Amino acid sequence: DPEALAAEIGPVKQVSLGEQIDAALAQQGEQLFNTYCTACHRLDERFIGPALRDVTKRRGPVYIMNTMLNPNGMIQRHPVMKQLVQEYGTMDTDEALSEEQARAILEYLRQVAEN
Numbered sequence: 001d002p003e004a005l006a007a008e009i010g011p012v013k014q015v016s017l018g019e020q021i022d023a024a025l026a027q028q029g030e031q032l033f034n035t036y037c038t039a040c041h042r043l044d045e046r047f048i049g050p051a052l053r054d055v056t057k058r059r060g061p062v063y064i065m066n067t068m069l070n071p072n073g074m075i076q077r078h079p080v081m082k083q084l085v086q087e088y089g090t091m092d093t094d095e096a097l098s099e100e101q102a103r104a105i106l107e108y109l110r111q112v113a114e115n
């Protein structure tokens with residue numbers, strides 16, 4: 001259900017996640033997260049947006065990737081995101097990331113959920 005709607009919104013459609021964390025990829029994601037995402041997010045505390053340490057436990061990868069890559073489409077069309085907007089407010093969250101960058105950040109998010 002929520003991953004399918006996230007795929008339809010796009011641009012990412014599918015992310016097949018291998019069982020292991022790729023630590024080098026995650027490390028690039030850590031650096032990116034601390035450049036772009038900590039303007040508004042923390043791992044364990046609310047801030048401008050929701051806490052994210054366990055985002056990969058409550059959401060899937062297509063939703064997370066398309067939040068980074070198409071935040072406007074997600075805000076407009078995805079019911080989970082639309083509800084979070086009513087709670088946290090409307091602001092420019094688009095960091096103009098590449099898919100590569102977003103993928104690295106996802107790997108970091110997966111890693112911190114195992115800490």
Ligand code: HEC
Nearest residue numbers: 036037039040048049050064067084085088089092093095
């Ligand atoms: C402040 C300008 C933000 C920046 C920069 C980033 N995010 Fe964000 N995020 C923000 C808000 C206010 C919200 C709630 C929705 C709304 O627009 O009001 C979010 C939400 C998310 C989510 C969804 C969390 C959930 O539990 O489903 C994710 C996965 C997310 N944000 C990720 C994320 C990442 C990885 C960022 C750096 C690339 C990032 N956001 C930037 C506010 C802001």
